[PDB]
Write a protein that binds this DNA or RNA. Structure first.
Lengths: 297, 119, 113, 98
RNA sequence: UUGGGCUCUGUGGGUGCUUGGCCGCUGGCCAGACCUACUUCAAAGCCACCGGGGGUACCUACCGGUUG
RNA sequence: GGAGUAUGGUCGCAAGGCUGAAAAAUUGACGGAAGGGCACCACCAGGGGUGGAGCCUGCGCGCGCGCUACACUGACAGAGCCAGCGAGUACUCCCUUGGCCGAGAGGCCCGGGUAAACUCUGUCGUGCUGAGGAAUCCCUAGUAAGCGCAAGUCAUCAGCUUGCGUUGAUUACGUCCCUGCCCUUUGUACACACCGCCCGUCGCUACUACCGAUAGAGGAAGUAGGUCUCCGUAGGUGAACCUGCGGAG
């Protein structure tokens, strides 16, 4: 098995580099079709490209479906999207404290088909191989500083990304007494993304969005009383998760229930959790000159 | 290619051929009819015969050792044995190739890495 | 899958590789799968809290079968051995070889004895 | 990977098993076998709204009951259950001052 | 046990249930032998495996014509 | 000169205040009772923190999250025995009395302030030499606790954080009775099989009729059976032959 996952990993990378070359070519290909459509002149080189014309007549239509939005692009994710209710586990670092294990409990309760594990004295690549041995679709290590959370690692198997991200401004459930708070409403919530506009933005949106069970596509707007909201300004992914009650069609009444994160994500390593041979897809670049000022996301 | 580009059944046949070949082991992509047009290759079928795939997967060194080895039969494929050195190997099976129940090739490996355990 | 609903009950998992053999216990409760994970997996299913259990093997699995007296379960492994395990006390009551006991060969196109 | 799972029908007849069978002189089946018609009573008839008569309606039990004999109470109750199924799926100064 | 070993080669058997060697065989031969006769009437069709896209000046074939 | 691709200049429109902050709907609104599934935010069995004293980051003198002290779980002495992370010409506990050699800036010299564990053997015998309530929160197989040794991964973390190895248990592993949460009472594939039209208040839509002001918008309520052959004929295209009619086998 481990063979066939590793062989699929390297295969996926090989198709990616091929996609780079053929994408640079297809940049020249796409210029033809609309030029045929509008009759406007083109650059006579691209005109007098022979292999372009032959391969064109063979392979227009996949670009047509790309324009249509029909097809599902290659990535880590889009193999089985709205099929497997994505199992998600959580486990902290080596020796958790009380508040930490309660907050990991809560975030198990925030993502709705999440199971929790306790880690004990157990080895990191064997945790990875064991989750791979149960065919998961997530893993989330959450670390602590002194009875407060630090860093979430939204990693997504079989070989996708690890978003390692520091959390800031977190306060838990278990400070507010059990009379005032209630036991959590575990339903398959909705998901709302506010402000993501760069292709890296939508990449992070994808790896968040596949942490959620596929909402049943019949009456998505009306049913469901539970929503989760990610929103970003100054690269800062901030989440608030609210159970609403809807007193009217002109007024809806919220109830803050899930915790308050504002995570800043500092790496998307295109390689799974431990794999220190990492393909660094992006990072928070401090320390450079205008990387403090300018904005990704 | 002859079919008009707006045809739904044409796109379905496109994805059909490309998915079946990408899971076959000939091709490399899953996106280009052009790649079908002048990439599909009798050398690609040759590259998917079971001698050369155990060479690339680094069982033997070159295709002489591989082919002689298979003639005297040392390579199981999942569960069966192998006699007939053109067992085509799909991308799904190129992991479950391995050596047979107990052969001296297995014991060459294990005698070298000093995990030789006669049991 | 479940024969009345017909929709997918559940993926089970715990297998390093494909599941080569499948057998059910005639009581209706216990499953066994056998696979090239080098595992024999007893699947405790129809209580509420499902579990697995490994019988680790020195070898790989080719077939599994049962006793109607459902305490006993046997495994055929490709090195030749057959093994009877007590199913509750998931432990080897016996094992035996079968290599020479089925060694009948010289198929054509072979340069072996 | 095998194929795309395509939708496909197969039109049955009402013949017996031993009529569907292949060619033998005498079936393995006995005499209690050899008469069932490949289709259940549900198949040979389903009580339903589209096959109902005019003045009456059928229930989920399969009982045709008349709107005429039905009272307002179970009328409203039946309508409530069906709605729940759907849910789960220049003037004058005289006019002005007077 | 009054020399023995490895290694290679050669022969025969058997590695499948025991009915002749040959011929122009209801018969003959194994040393063989005989050698060239006799004659009423061609044939019913079909099938027939070349790697793909592409060109057809000339050749082949098919179809449809044309002079004689 | 043609074609794009930009960069900012120029002009037109958007750029005229019945105004003065605080629905739709045949599908709609809220419930309840029966039936299942689930859960260490539930029961049952157990464990273990924090909460007592102190240190102290963080959060708003208070607070928890860690760390440390607390006596048989003793000490001291000998003896005996096993690991995983580990390698950037690279890592240092200060700051000072003297003296050396330095016309001066210093360098010397001397002082002052490759585990833990375990097992075995003996020598002593409880001794200001006391293991954290109410509360709450967590946890079911390499799970809990105890122990160390390392690395310091741009982000956070040395008042620590993170790895990794070592010794490894009790107690459940049933159940929906408490609290719950989810979802069934629609739709979603057919067999042998079983079941057998939940309920509420209203709303909305159609219709009926009313009421009264001055055609009218409202208020309120209710209903939704003569073939074959032969013969005799008449006509046809004549020998024949066909058709129509009438008799026989």
């Amino acid at each position: 098995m481990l063979r066939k996952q590793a062989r699929q990993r390297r295969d996926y990378l090989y198709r990616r580099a091929l996609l780079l070359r053929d994408a640079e070519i297809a940049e020249k290909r796409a210029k033809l079709r609309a030029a045929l459509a509008s009759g406007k002149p083109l650059d006579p080189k691209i005109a007098n490209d022979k292999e372009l014309r032959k391969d064109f007549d063979y392979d227009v239509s996949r670009d047509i479906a790309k324009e249509q939005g029909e097809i599902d692009i290659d990535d880590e994710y889009s193999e089985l999207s709205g099929i497997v209710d994505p199992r998600v586990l959580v486990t902290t670092s080596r020796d958790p404290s009380s508040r930490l294990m309660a907050f990991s409990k809560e975030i198990r309760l925030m993502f709705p088909t999440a199971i929790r594990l306790n880690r004990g004295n157990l080895i990191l690549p064997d945790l990875v191989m064991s989750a791979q041995r149960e065919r998961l679709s997530d893993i989330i290590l959450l670390h602590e500083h002194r009875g407060t959370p630090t860093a979430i690692t939204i990693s997504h198997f079989p070989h996708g990304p690890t978003l390692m991200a520091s959390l800031h401004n977190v306060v838990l459930r278990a400070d507010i007494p059990k009379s005032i708070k209630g036991t959590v409403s575990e339903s398959y919530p909705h998901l709302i993304f506010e402000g993501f506009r760069t292709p890296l933005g939508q990449r992070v949106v994808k790896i968040l969005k596949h942490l959620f069970p596929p909402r049943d596509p019949t009456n998505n707007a009306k049913s469901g009383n539970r929503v989760i909201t990610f929103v970003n300004q100054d690269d800062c992914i901030e989440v608030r998760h609210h159970v609403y009650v809807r007193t009217n069609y002109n007024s809806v009444e919220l109830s803050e229930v899930g915790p308050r994160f504002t995570m800043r994500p500092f790496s998307i390593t295109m390689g799974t959790l431990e794999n220190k041979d990492a393909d660094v897809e992006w990072h928070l670049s401090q320390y450079t000159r205008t990387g403090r000022k300018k904005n990704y996301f | 290619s002859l079919l008009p580009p707006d045809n739904e059944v044409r796109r379905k046949h496109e994805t059909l051929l490309l998915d079946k070949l990408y899971d076959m082991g000939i091709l490399s992509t899953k996106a280009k009819l052009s790649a079908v047009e002048h990439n599909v290759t009798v050398s690609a079928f040759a590259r998917r015969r079971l001698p050369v795939v155990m060479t690339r997967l680094r069982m033997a060194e070159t295709v002489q050792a591989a082919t002689k080895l298979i003639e005297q039969g040392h390579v199981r494929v999942g569960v069966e044995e192998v006699r007939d050195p053109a067992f085509l190997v799909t991308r799904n099976m190129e992991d479950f190739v391995t050596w047979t129940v107990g052969s001296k090739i297995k014991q060459n490996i294990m005698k070298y890495r000093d995990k030789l355990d006669d049991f | 899958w479940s024969v009345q609903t017909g929709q997918l009950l559940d993926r089970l998992s715990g297998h390093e590789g494909p599941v080569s053999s499948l057998a059910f216990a005639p009581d209706g409760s216990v499953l066994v799968s056998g696979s090239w994970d080098r595992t024999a997996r007893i699947w405790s299913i129809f209580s509420r809290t499902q579990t697995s259990e490994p019988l680790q093997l020195q070898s790989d699995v080719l077939d599994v079968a049962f006793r109607p007296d459902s305490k006993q379960i046997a495994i055929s492994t490709l090195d030749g051995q057959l093994t009877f395990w007590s199913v509750s006390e998931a432990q080897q009551v016996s094992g035996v070889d079968g290599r020479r006991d089925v060694s009948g060969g010289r198929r054509i196109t072979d340069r072996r004895t | 990977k095998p194929k795309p799972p395509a939708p496909t029908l197969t039109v049955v007849s009402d013949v017996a098993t031993v009529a569907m069978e292949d060619a033998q002189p005498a079936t393995a089946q006995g005499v209690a076998g050899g008469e069932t018609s490949m289709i259940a009573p549900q198949e040979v008839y389903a009580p339903s709204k589209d096959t109902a008569e005019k003045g009456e309606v059928v229930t989920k039990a399969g009982i045709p009951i008349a709107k005429q004999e039905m009272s307002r109470e179970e009328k409203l109750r039946r309508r409530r259950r069906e709605k729940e199924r759907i849910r789960k799926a220049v003037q004058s100064s005289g006019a002005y001052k007077l």
